Amino acid sequence: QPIDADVTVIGSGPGGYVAAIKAAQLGFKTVCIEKNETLGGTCLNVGCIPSKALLNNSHYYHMAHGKDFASRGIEMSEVRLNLDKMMEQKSTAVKALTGGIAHLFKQNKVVHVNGYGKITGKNQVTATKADGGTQVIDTKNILIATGSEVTPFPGITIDEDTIVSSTGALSLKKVPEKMVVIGAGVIGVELCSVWQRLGADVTAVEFLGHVGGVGIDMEISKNFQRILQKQGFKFKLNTKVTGATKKSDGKIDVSIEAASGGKAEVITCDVLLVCIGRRPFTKNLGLEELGIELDPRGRIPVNTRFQTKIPNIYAIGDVVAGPMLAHKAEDEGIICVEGMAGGAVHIDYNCVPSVIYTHPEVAWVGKSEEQLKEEGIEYKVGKFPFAANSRAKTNADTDGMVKILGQKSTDRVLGAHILGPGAGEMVNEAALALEYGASCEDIARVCHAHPTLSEAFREANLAASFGKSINF
Amino acid sequence: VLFQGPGADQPIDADVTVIGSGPGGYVAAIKAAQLGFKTVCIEKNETLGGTCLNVGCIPSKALLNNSHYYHMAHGKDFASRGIEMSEVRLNLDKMMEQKSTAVKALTGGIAHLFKQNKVVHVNGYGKITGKNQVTATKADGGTQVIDTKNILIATGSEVTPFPGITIDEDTIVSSTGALSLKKVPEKMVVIGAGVIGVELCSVWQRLGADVTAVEFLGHVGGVGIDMEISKNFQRILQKQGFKFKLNTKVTGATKKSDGKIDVSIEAASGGKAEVITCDVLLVCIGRRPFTKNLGLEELGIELDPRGRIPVNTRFQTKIPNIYAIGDVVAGPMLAHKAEDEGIICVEGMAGGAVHIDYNCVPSVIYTHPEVAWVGKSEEQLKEEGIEYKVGKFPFAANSRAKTNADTDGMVKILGQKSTDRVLGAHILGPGAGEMVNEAALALEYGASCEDIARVCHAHPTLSEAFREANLAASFGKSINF
Ligand SMILES: Cc1cc2nc3c(=O)[nH]c(=O)nc-3n(C[C@H](O)[C@H](O)[C@H](O)COP(=O)(O)OP(=O)(O)OC[C@H]3O[C@@H](n4cnc5c(N)ncnc54)[C@H](O)[C@@H]3O)c2cc1C
Ligand SMILES: Cc1cc2nc3c(=O)[nH]c(=O)nc-3n(C[C@H](O)[C@H](O)[C@H](O)COP(=O)(O)OP(=O)(O)OC[C@H]3O[C@@H](n4cnc5c(N)ncnc54)[C@H](O)[C@@H]3O)c2cc1C
């Protein structure tokens, strides 16, 4: 009882479920195979959505429990945490959005097959369900969107009990008294902040010498770290972990040393979060038998139409090269299926923004100062602090700055870097500016509403273009 | 030298003399100095920054922010997130202190910016006493003459009075009195359902007042707002507790011996006479240009019927070296509009071309949900005979809005039917105020709906609703709805 299809998508994360919807909208008979109980992939079920929910809820807890609400005349005798209820709010959002994808599939006539997909021919995918039943799909095109998994730390076994990945850390049943996080990238700093805010003593251990992962601008990263340390973060940068021991009393002893060598020490904690990275997931997909070889980092090599070496078999998202982000996977899914229908296929990874949803937030798009130097680009800098922005000052939330990097000969915007309130939303104005090739003067002369945080983006461009802002 | 207050009465020479230190005047003065002009700014009030900083945008946004958080804590929202509190109490004195702290910091900042940029601040009442002369009259009665090549009038606006109802800032208040009420009124009536009125209503509603807005026109939110957005906005505000009497005129108000106020109303067309009682009456029917005792009549600068100073596209009055910008001239009475006019006016004084497109000036309403728009409404496009297409995306389908349990409203995009050019953007929902600036940048380039749809917006953000509404306008269908 095989199914015939034009496009068969393996995986229902941001890349796969959006690709499936768009393919159906373009007229393809479309199937989407998912092995998990719900649709939406890593981002919806154990990723972006649960993490942002806990960041929001823990931020508001900090505002009520700390000094902020009192300073605004909102007085409360006793603020208490109900962690079960906070986790419930998180789970409600996840359930609503995963159900929403199932309805979108029905609305657009995408056939949902529940099982573990394996490519069993150039034009065939077989999905094996939990009970061993099979469903064969004979298909013109195959779109691999199988995503990522957590990168294990050699010698340390994650059990999601006291040694957790991001999945376990998002569902802890009590606030750990003491918590250690291996990895001070985006995911690690976010999860650190959640549990710090809810009462944990948190330490982030990082082999590199800065916070925030790859590609973040160094000046932004140092300033971000300083703000976080004032919030209660403790950082062990330039530090390697040599091992972790699960102890008889339930606690964990973590052995660390200086990254360059020496200064060996041990620190004890109640929960260890292993968050050193993620890697492409292709297990048992049938690639070896087809001859589709992986690159040394486990990614599927693809061409500019996202075709593998077998031209009707495609791959997108966290399973191929480029930034491992939800909106990147989505755009790759859209343009891949547009290309299947004969159209142009374009994504510019220099215009793909990054966001860290701490408070303050961090967001950037385009090039860092380190990248411009390494490329030998002559640039100029404009900065504007949020302390001088009217909306930030009115809200009494004034950490950080906007930094703009501009090309000297043309005034072209080369990069935008935002540390402070509203950075996540603000970077999308910046992404539009980079896609259009805007000059710094262009953005300085656009009438931004007053009072808005976006005026800091305008003023930083004015500084880069004219040399001087108005309000600083 | 850089501050000329009482006792400082020697004559001054300047290239540019700016009368008024509001958003238009103080930015014009800074930019003039940065361009190389010897610049003077005359201000009659105790602080710089005009209506917006002292009694306007800044205090109102501070109270909107604080009252929204009071509502999150005192209502259901914080409890839904596992944040349990025994007793949430309002300390209005402390809330007002946070507001005043912000205003003081920002007014002090302008004075520092004037010093940094070598702008001479003259504290007095400026009158134009010759084609190239302004005389400032100071608090002590002293006078100071400024001989100047150019004059820039930036004298701003005032509250529009209501005949027969005397504002006393006690129980009958303007927006100024409403921003400093000493206690939450049990019942408040607002005459005028425009932007300022709805914002002030929302503040006091959140803090415990029973609020009613009376409006002579048939919609909420002032001039130019899209009618679909306005209707949806009104329905949301009614569920928050607002009561609206649209298409209604006020015939009078009487302060009673017991301190309460009886407001007499009728249908705008006639009939249906009623009386409604309140503890505080806010008179918010508009603002109007302020030019009192400026010397215009003697110069021969006549005003238009609404009191504005007529100017050409370089912002020149009938006297070619005398200019005017901001709330005293035509166009949207908004802070960023006054700022941009001041900048390009002084750039024009320095030899540059002068052009501004009021169709690219955004408007924002800082309620929760917010409202923001830029470009054209459906009503404008219809009246102009423009063929257009519509794309909508509801915030209920946006991942960041749903995750924060903050899902009112939608983004609506209007695109040209044949060319896909973005013609207007209308946002009702969370984050509208910041989001409209992405739309303003798009309009500057004449971008298409497809252009915006193909920009990689971060996930999860509210801005994705803007992306998806453009995708719907361009392709006919969004992804996530
Ligand atoms: C804690 C956390 C926070 C994050 N926060 C953000 C954020 O704020 N913003 C951001 O942009 N990104 C964020 N990310 C990253 C984001 O989750 C990923 O970039 C994105 O989910 C990748 O999309 P994808 O569709 O390529 O893969 P995935 O989301 O990983 O989806 C792959 C799907 O394929 C299924 N699958 C795999 N193999 C098969 C098979 N053989 N048969 C059937 N089904 C199969 C998997 O079960 C899964 O459902 C975060 C990630 C984590 C872990
Ligand atoms: C409650 C309220 C909320 C508002 N919220 C917003 C908002 O969120 N966003 C927005 O964009 N706009 C908002 N506005 C409108 C905004 O304040 C005005 O558009 C803006 O202030 C006008 O700028 P201006 O420089 O033209 O005039 P004004 O700000 O009115 O400044 C004029 C200045 O000139 C001085 N002056 C006048 N005559 C003389 C004289 N002869 N000699 C010396 N000095 C003189 C006055 O004292 C005053 O300081 C709000 C207004 C109110 C009342």
mmCIF file of all heavy atoms in Angstrom, chain A residues 17 57 73 75 77-78 80 82 391 425 428 436 438 442 445 453-454 471, chain B residues 26 81-82 84 86 89 91 347 370 400 434 437 445 451 458 462-463 467 480:
data_model
loop_
_atom_site.group_PDB
_atom_site.id
_atom_site.type_symbol
_atom_site.label_atom_id
_atom_site.label_comp_id
_atom_site.label_asym_id
_atom_site.label_seq_id
_atom_site.Cartn_x
_atom_site.Cartn_y
_atom_site.Cartn_z
ATOM 1 N N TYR A 17 9.138 21.183 8.268
ATOM 2 C CA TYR A 17 7.710 21.468 8.251
ATOM 3 C C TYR A 17 7.406 22.686 7.374
ATOM 4 O O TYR A 17 6.379 22.699 6.661
ATOM 5 C CB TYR A 17 7.137 21.644 9.679
ATOM 6 C CG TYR A 17 7.009 23.046 10.252
ATOM 7 C CD1 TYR A 17 5.985 23.854 9.848
ATOM 8 C CD2 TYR A 17 7.888 23.497 11.200
ATOM 9 C CE1 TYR A 17 5.857 25.184 10.368
ATOM 10 C CE2 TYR A 17 7.758 24.792 11.746
ATOM 11 C CZ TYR A 17 6.744 25.600 11.298
ATOM 12 O OH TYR A 17 6.590 26.911 11.809
ATOM 13 N N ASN A 57 9.551 33.928 31.767
ATOM 14 C CA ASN A 57 8.956 33.724 33.071
ATOM 15 C C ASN A 57 9.955 34.011 34.175
ATOM 16 O O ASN A 57 9.588 34.621 35.176
ATOM 17 C CB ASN A 57 8.415 32.277 33.180
ATOM 18 C CG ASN A 57 7.238 32.026 32.241
ATOM 19 O OD1 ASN A 57 6.646 32.955 31.684
ATOM 20 N ND2 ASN A 57 6.887 30.756 32.070
ATOM 21 N N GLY A 73 6.699 51.435 42.212
ATOM 22 C CA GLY A 73 5.516 51.569 43.038
ATOM 23 C C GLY A 73 4.618 50.355 43.034
ATOM 24 O O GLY A 73 3.430 50.468 43.391
ATOM 25 N N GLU A 75 4.247 47.157 44.959
ATOM 26 C CA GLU A 75 4.749 46.642 46.227
ATOM 27 C C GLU A 75 4.098 45.301 46.560
ATOM 28 O O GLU A 75 2.872 45.175 46.559
ATOM 29 C CB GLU A 75 4.510 47.659 47.344
ATOM 30 C CG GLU A 75 5.345 48.926 47.193
ATOM 31 C CD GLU A 75 5.060 49.980 48.259
ATOM 32 O OE1 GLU A 75 4.109 49.816 49.065
ATOM 33 O OE2 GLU A 75 5.800 50.990 48.297
ATOM 34 N N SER A 77 4.311 41.869 49.306
ATOM 35 C CA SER A 77 4.837 41.434 50.599
ATOM 36 C C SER A 77 5.749 40.220 50.458
ATOM 37 O O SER A 77 6.834 40.174 51.055
ATOM 38 C CB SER A 77 3.679 41.138 51.551
ATOM 39 O OG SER A 77 2.618 40.498 50.869
ATOM 40 N N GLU A 78 5.322 39.215 49.695
ATOM 41 C CA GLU A 78 6.062 37.952 49.629
ATOM 42 C C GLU A 78 5.895 37.377 48.231
ATOM 43 O O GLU A 78 4.795 36.970 47.853
ATOM 44 C CB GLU A 78 5.581 36.964 50.694
ATOM 45 C CG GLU A 78 4.125 37.140 51.105
ATOM 46 C CD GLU A 78 3.748 36.319 52.331
ATOM 47 O OE1 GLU A 78 3.329 35.154 52.169
ATOM 48 O OE2 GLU A 78 3.873 36.842 53.456
ATOM 49 N N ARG A 80 6.834 34.366 45.819
ATOM 50 C CA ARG A 80 7.259 32.962 45.891
ATOM 51 C C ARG A 80 7.216 32.323 44.512
ATOM 52 O O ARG A 80 6.354 32.632 43.681
ATOM 53 C CB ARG A 80 6.372 32.188 46.867
ATOM 54 C CG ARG A 80 6.282 32.825 48.244
ATOM 55 C CD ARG A 80 7.299 32.244 49.211
ATOM 56 N NE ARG A 80 7.812 33.266 50.123
ATOM 57 C CZ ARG A 80 7.106 33.838 51.092
ATOM 58 N NH1 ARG A 80 5.838 33.503 51.288
ATOM 59 N NH2 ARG A 80 7.669 34.757 51.861
ATOM 60 N N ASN A 82 6.526 29.151 42.149
ATOM 61 C CA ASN A 82 5.853 27.864 41.967
ATOM 62 C C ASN A 82 6.420 27.257 40.680
ATOM 63 O O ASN A 82 5.933 27.521 39.581
ATOM 64 C CB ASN A 82 4.335 28.024 41.914
ATOM 65 C CG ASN A 82 3.607 26.684 41.810
ATOM 66 O OD1 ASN A 82 4.178 25.677 41.370
ATOM 67 N ND2 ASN A 82 2.344 26.667 42.213
ATOM 68 N N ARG A 391 13.397 55.999 25.211
ATOM 69 C CA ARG A 391 12.504 54.926 25.676
ATOM 70 C C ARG A 391 13.172 54.073 26.735
ATOM 71 O O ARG A 391 12.530 53.691 27.715
ATOM 72 C CB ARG A 391 12.002 54.051 24.521
ATOM 73 C CG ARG A 391 10.885 53.105 24.969
ATOM 74 C CD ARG A 391 10.169 52.406 23.831
ATOM 75 N NE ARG A 391 8.900 51.830 24.261
ATOM 76 C CZ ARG A 391 8.106 51.065 23.502
ATOM 77 N NH1 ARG A 391 8.456 50.760 22.242
ATOM 78 N NH2 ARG A 391 6.951 50.624 23.999
ATOM 79 N N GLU A 425 14.213 42.082 18.613
ATOM 80 C CA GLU A 425 13.343 42.633 17.591
ATOM 81 C C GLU A 425 14.094 43.603 16.703
ATOM 82 O O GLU A 425 13.851 43.660 15.489
ATOM 83 C CB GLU A 425 12.116 43.324 18.245
ATOM 84 C CG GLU A 425 11.189 42.407 19.053
ATOM 85 C CD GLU A 425 10.622 41.249 18.281
ATOM 86 O OE1 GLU A 425 10.431 41.361 17.027
ATOM 87 O OE2 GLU A 425 10.349 40.203 18.934
ATOM 88 N N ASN A 428 16.077 42.807 13.285
ATOM 89 C CA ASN A 428 15.375 42.563 12.032
ATOM 90 C C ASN A 428 15.300 43.793 11.154
ATOM 91 O O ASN A 428 15.379 43.663 9.933
ATOM 92 C CB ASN A 428 13.993 41.999 12.306
ATOM 93 C CG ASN A 428 14.067 40.693 13.103
ATOM 94 O OD1 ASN A 428 14.530 39.668 12.567
ATOM 95 N ND2 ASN A 428 13.728 40.753 14.395
ATOM 96 N N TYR A 436 19.294 45.049 1.767
ATOM 97 C CA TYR A 436 19.163 46.105 0.773
ATOM 98 C C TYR A 436 20.480 46.784 0.444
ATOM 99 O O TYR A 436 20.511 47.685 -0.429
ATOM 100 C CB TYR A 436 18.084 47.137 1.239
ATOM 101 C CG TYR A 436 16.938 47.145 0.244
ATOM 102 C CD1 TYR A 436 15.903 46.251 0.378
ATOM 103 C CD2 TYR A 436 16.903 48.058 -0.815
ATOM 104 C CE1 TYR A 436 14.868 46.209 -0.537
ATOM 105 C CE2 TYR A 436 15.857 48.046 -1.737
ATOM 106 C CZ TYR A 436 14.849 47.088 -1.591
ATOM 107 O OH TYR A 436 13.808 47.032 -2.512
ATOM 108 N N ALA A 438 22.108 48.869 2.529
ATOM 109 C CA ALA A 438 21.901 50.249 2.998
ATOM 110 C C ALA A 438 23.221 50.888 3.375
ATOM 111 O O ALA A 438 24.182 50.213 3.791
ATOM 112 C CB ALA A 438 20.966 50.238 4.199
ATOM 113 N N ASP A 442 21.623 56.347 4.900
ATOM 114 C CA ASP A 442 20.260 55.910 4.644
ATOM 115 C C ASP A 442 19.472 55.741 5.947
ATOM 116 O O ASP A 442 18.341 56.238 6.085
ATOM 117 C CB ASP A 442 20.253 54.544 3.914
ATOM 118 C CG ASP A 442 20.587 54.603 2.417
ATOM 119 O OD1 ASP A 442 20.607 55.692 1.778
ATOM 120 O OD2 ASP A 442 20.782 53.454 1.863
ATOM 121 N N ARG A 445 18.668 58.858 8.141
ATOM 122 C CA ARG A 445 17.670 59.758 7.579
ATOM 123 C C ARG A 445 16.263 59.176 7.537
ATOM 124 O O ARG A 445 15.341 59.879 7.137
ATOM 125 C CB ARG A 445 18.098 60.171 6.192
ATOM 126 C CG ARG A 445 19.345 61.036 6.190
ATOM 127 C CD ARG A 445 19.588 61.755 4.877
ATOM 128 N NE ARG A 445 20.748 62.625 4.986
ATOM 129 C CZ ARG A 445 20.727 63.863 5.507
ATOM 130 N NH1 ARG A 445 19.600 64.391 5.975
ATOM 131 N NH2 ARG A 445 21.843 64.591 5.548
ATOM 132 N N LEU A 453 13.186 52.330 21.166
ATOM 133 C CA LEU A 453 14.538 51.808 21.263
ATOM 134 C C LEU A 453 15.242 51.878 19.919
ATOM 135 O O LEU A 453 16.457 52.073 19.873
ATOM 136 C CB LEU A 453 14.502 50.381 21.795
ATOM 137 C CG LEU A 453 13.864 50.161 23.141
ATOM 138 C CD1 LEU A 453 13.666 48.667 23.456
ATOM 139 C CD2 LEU A 453 14.693 50.760 24.249
ATOM 140 N N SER A 454 14.487 51.762 18.811
ATOM 141 C CA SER A 454 15.063 51.799 17.483
ATOM 142 C C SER A 454 15.810 53.104 17.209
ATOM 143 O O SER A 454 16.703 53.139 16.349
ATOM 144 C CB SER A 454 13.948 51.626 16.428
ATOM 145 O OG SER A 454 13.221 52.899 16.198
ATOM 146 N N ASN A 471 21.972 62.884 20.094
ATOM 147 C CA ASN A 471 21.675 62.795 21.519
ATOM 148 C C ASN A 471 22.802 62.179 22.351
ATOM 149 O O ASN A 471 22.594 61.865 23.531
ATOM 150 C CB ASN A 471 20.375 62.036 21.736
ATOM 151 C CG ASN A 471 19.155 62.888 21.363
ATOM 152 O OD1 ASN A 471 18.796 63.844 22.081
ATOM 153 N ND2 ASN A 471 18.532 62.560 20.233
ATOM 154 N N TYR B 26 15.414 71.885 19.891
ATOM 155 C CA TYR B 26 16.690 71.506 20.491
ATOM 156 C C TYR B 26 17.513 70.646 19.527
ATOM 157 O O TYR B 26 18.731 70.801 19.460
ATOM 158 C CB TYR B 26 16.492 70.825 21.865
ATOM 159 C CG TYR B 26 16.478 69.317 21.896
ATOM 160 C CD1 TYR B 26 17.657 68.591 21.818
ATOM 161 C CD2 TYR B 26 15.291 68.624 22.055
ATOM 162 C CE1 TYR B 26 17.627 67.168 21.845
ATOM 163 C CE2 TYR B 26 15.279 67.190 22.083
ATOM 164 C CZ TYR B 26 16.439 66.535 22.003
ATOM 165 O OH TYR B 26 16.455 65.106 22.010
ATOM 166 N N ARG B 81 2.262 32.225 35.414
ATOM 167 C CA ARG B 81 3.648 31.868 35.176
ATOM 168 C C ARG B 81 4.329 31.288 36.406
ATOM 169 O O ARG B 81 5.552 31.101 36.377
ATOM 170 C CB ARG B 81 4.432 33.097 34.704
ATOM 171 C CG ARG B 81 3.804 33.842 33.577
ATOM 172 C CD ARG B 81 4.575 35.134 33.261
ATOM 173 N NE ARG B 81 3.914 35.930 32.246
ATOM 174 C CZ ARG B 81 4.054 35.770 30.940
ATOM 175 N NH1 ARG B 81 4.840 34.807 30.448
ATOM 176 N NH2 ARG B 81 3.404 36.575 30.112
ATOM 177 N N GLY B 82 3.582 31.033 37.484
ATOM 178 C CA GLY B 82 4.167 30.508 38.703
ATOM 179 C C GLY B 82 4.810 31.546 39.593
ATOM 180 O O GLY B 82 5.667 31.203 40.416
ATOM 181 N N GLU B 84 3.947 33.788 42.474
ATOM 182 C CA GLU B 84 2.862 33.866 43.441
ATOM 183 C C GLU B 84 3.180 34.959 44.453
ATOM 184 O O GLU B 84 4.275 34.995 45.017
ATOM 185 C CB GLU B 84 2.649 32.513 44.112
ATOM 186 C CG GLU B 84 2.172 31.466 43.102
ATOM 187 C CD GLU B 84 2.024 30.072 43.687
ATOM 188 O OE1 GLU B 84 2.402 29.838 44.870
ATOM 189 O OE2 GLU B 84 1.530 29.196 42.948
ATOM 190 N N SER B 86 1.409 37.397 47.698
ATOM 191 C CA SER B 86 0.297 37.474 48.633
ATOM 192 C C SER B 86 -0.547 38.718 48.389
ATOM 193 O O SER B 86 -1.782 38.641 48.329
ATOM 194 C CB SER B 86 0.823 37.466 50.067
ATOM 195 O OG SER B 86 1.768 38.505 50.254
ATOM 196 N N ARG B 89 0.177 45.789 45.977
ATOM 197 C CA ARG B 89 -0.331 47.101 46.362
ATOM 198 C C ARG B 89 0.265 48.157 45.434
ATOM 199 O O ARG B 89 1.414 48.048 44.997
ATOM 200 C CB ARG B 89 0.040 47.462 47.801
ATOM 201 C CG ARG B 89 -0.332 46.454 48.868
ATOM 202 C CD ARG B 89 -1.651 46.780 49.537
ATOM 203 N NE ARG B 89 -1.799 46.042 50.792
ATOM 204 C CZ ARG B 89 -2.388 44.855 50.916
ATOM 205 N NH1 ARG B 89 -2.908 44.245 49.860
ATOM 206 N NH2 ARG B 89 -2.458 44.281 52.107
ATOM 207 N N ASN B 91 1.682 51.879 45.090
ATOM 208 C CA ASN B 91 2.224 53.057 45.770
ATOM 209 C C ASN B 91 2.341 54.133 44.682
ATOM 210 O O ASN B 91 3.336 54.211 43.965
ATOM 211 C CB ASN B 91 3.566 52.770 46.419
ATOM 212 C CG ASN B 91 4.128 53.954 47.148
ATOM 213 O OD1 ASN B 91 3.758 55.119 46.871
ATOM 214 N ND2 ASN B 91 5.022 53.693 48.091
ATOM 215 N N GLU B 347 19.945 71.862 7.619
ATOM 216 C CA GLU B 347 20.756 71.403 6.511
ATOM 217 C C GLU B 347 20.500 72.259 5.279
ATOM 218 O O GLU B 347 21.427 72.574 4.527
ATOM 219 C CB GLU B 347 20.457 69.912 6.240
ATOM 220 C CG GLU B 347 21.029 69.007 7.289
ATOM 221 C CD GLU B 347 20.682 67.509 7.051
ATOM 222 O OE1 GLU B 347 19.778 67.224 6.244
ATOM 223 O OE2 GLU B 347 21.305 66.640 7.686
ATOM 224 N N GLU B 370 -0.079 47.634 21.612
ATOM 225 C CA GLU B 370 0.286 48.860 20.907
ATOM 226 C C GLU B 370 -0.378 48.899 19.534
ATOM 227 O O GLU B 370 -0.888 47.884 19.021
ATOM 228 C CB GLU B 370 1.805 48.952 20.785
ATOM 229 C CG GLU B 370 2.529 49.053 22.127
ATOM 230 C CD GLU B 370 4.035 49.087 22.007
ATOM 231 O OE1 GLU B 370 4.584 48.927 20.875
ATOM 232 O OE2 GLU B 370 4.708 49.274 23.046
ATOM 233 N N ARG B 400 6.656 33.941 19.164
ATOM 234 C CA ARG B 400 7.070 34.700 20.348
ATOM 235 C C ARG B 400 5.857 35.211 21.122
ATOM 236 O O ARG B 400 5.822 35.162 22.357
ATOM 237 C CB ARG B 400 8.002 35.859 19.974
ATOM 238 C CG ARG B 400 8.666 36.452 21.254
ATOM 239 C CD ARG B 400 9.763 37.506 20.934
ATOM 240 N NE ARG B 400 10.585 37.755 22.128
ATOM 241 C CZ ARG B 400 11.563 38.655 22.213
ATOM 242 N NH1 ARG B 400 11.864 39.429 21.168
ATOM 243 N NH2 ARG B 400 12.254 38.757 23.339
ATOM 244 N N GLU B 434 8.132 49.387 17.998
ATOM 245 C CA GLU B 434 9.455 49.122 17.451
ATOM 246 C C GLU B 434 9.380 48.568 16.035
ATOM 247 O O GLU B 434 10.231 48.893 15.189
ATOM 248 C CB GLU B 434 10.205 48.148 18.361
ATOM 249 C CG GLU B 434 10.449 48.611 19.788
ATOM 250 C CD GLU B 434 11.225 49.886 19.919
ATOM 251 O OE1 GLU B 434 12.087 50.188 19.050
ATOM 252 O OE2 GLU B 434 10.997 50.657 20.899
ATOM 253 N N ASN B 437 9.236 50.720 12.575
ATOM 254 C CA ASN B 437 10.429 51.306 12.028
ATOM 255 C C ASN B 437 11.081 50.420 10.964
ATOM 256 O O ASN B 437 11.728 50.949 10.051
ATOM 257 C CB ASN B 437 11.399 51.611 13.156
ATOM 258 C CG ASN B 437 10.783 52.562 14.166
ATOM 259 O OD1 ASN B 437 10.512 53.708 13.818
ATOM 260 N ND2 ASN B 437 10.487 52.053 15.378
ATOM 261 N N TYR B 445 12.995 52.751 0.589
ATOM 262 C CA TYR B 445 13.537 52.186 -0.626
ATOM 263 C C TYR B 445 12.477 51.855 -1.662
ATOM 264 O O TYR B 445 12.833 51.383 -2.747
ATOM 265 C CB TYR B 445 14.339 50.923 -0.300
ATOM 266 C CG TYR B 445 15.545 51.143 0.575
ATOM 267 C CD1 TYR B 445 15.697 50.424 1.749
ATOM 268 C CD2 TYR B 445 16.539 52.047 0.217
ATOM 269 C CE1 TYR B 445 16.811 50.612 2.556
ATOM 270 C CE2 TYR B 445 17.663 52.246 1.017
ATOM 271 C CZ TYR B 445 17.778 51.498 2.195
ATOM 272 O OH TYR B 445 18.876 51.657 2.995
ATOM 273 N N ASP B 451 10.220 41.534 -1.237
ATOM 274 C CA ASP B 451 11.482 41.930 -0.632
ATOM 275 C C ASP B 451 11.514 41.595 0.852
ATOM 276 O O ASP B 451 12.484 40.999 1.350
ATOM 277 C CB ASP B 451 11.706 43.454 -0.809
ATOM 278 C CG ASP B 451 12.142 43.860 -2.212
ATOM 279 O OD1 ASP B 451 12.559 43.015 -3.047
ATOM 280 O OD2 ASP B 451 12.111 45.108 -2.486
ATOM 281 N N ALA B 458 14.679 36.883 12.555
ATOM 282 C CA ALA B 458 15.063 35.923 13.607
ATOM 283 C C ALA B 458 13.843 35.172 14.150
ATOM 284 O O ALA B 458 12.749 35.729 14.261
ATOM 285 C CB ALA B 458 15.768 36.675 14.751
ATOM 286 N N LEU B 462 8.595 38.793 17.326
ATOM 287 C CA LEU B 462 7.350 39.361 16.859
ATOM 288 C C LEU B 462 7.459 39.809 15.400
ATOM 289 O O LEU B 462 6.452 39.835 14.677
ATOM 290 C CB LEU B 462 6.961 40.575 17.739
ATOM 291 C CG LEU B 462 6.799 40.239 19.210
ATOM 292 C CD1 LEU B 462 6.654 41.524 20.067
ATOM 293 C CD2 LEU B 462 5.593 39.335 19.449
ATOM 294 N N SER B 463 8.649 40.203 14.972
ATOM 295 C CA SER B 463 8.872 40.699 13.620
ATOM 296 C C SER B 463 8.506 39.654 12.579
ATOM 297 O O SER B 463 8.241 40.017 11.426
ATOM 298 C CB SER B 463 10.310 41.117 13.435
ATOM 299 O OG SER B 463 11.193 39.988 13.215
ATOM 300 N N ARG B 467 7.035 39.828 8.611
ATOM 301 C CA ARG B 467 7.455 39.012 7.471
ATOM 302 C C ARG B 467 6.277 38.253 6.864
ATOM 303 O O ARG B 467 6.066 38.292 5.642
ATOM 304 C CB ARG B 467 8.569 38.055 7.920
ATOM 305 C CG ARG B 467 9.009 37.066 6.823
ATOM 306 C CD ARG B 467 10.163 36.159 7.282
ATOM 307 N NE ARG B 467 10.040 34.768 6.802
ATOM 308 C CZ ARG B 467 10.986 34.118 6.141
ATOM 309 N NH1 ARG B 467 12.141 34.706 5.855
ATOM 310 N NH2 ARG B 467 10.771 32.826 5.764
ATOM 311 N N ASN B 480 2.579 30.186 8.273
ATOM 312 C CA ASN B 480 2.128 29.759 9.592
ATOM 313 C C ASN B 480 0.702 30.146 9.926
ATOM 314 O O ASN B 480 0.283 29.976 11.083
ATOM 315 C CB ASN B 480 3.067 30.282 10.653
ATOM 316 C CG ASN B 480 4.359 29.504 10.705
ATOM 317 O OD1 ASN B 480 4.385 28.376 11.198
ATOM 318 N ND2 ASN B 480 5.424 30.085 10.148
#
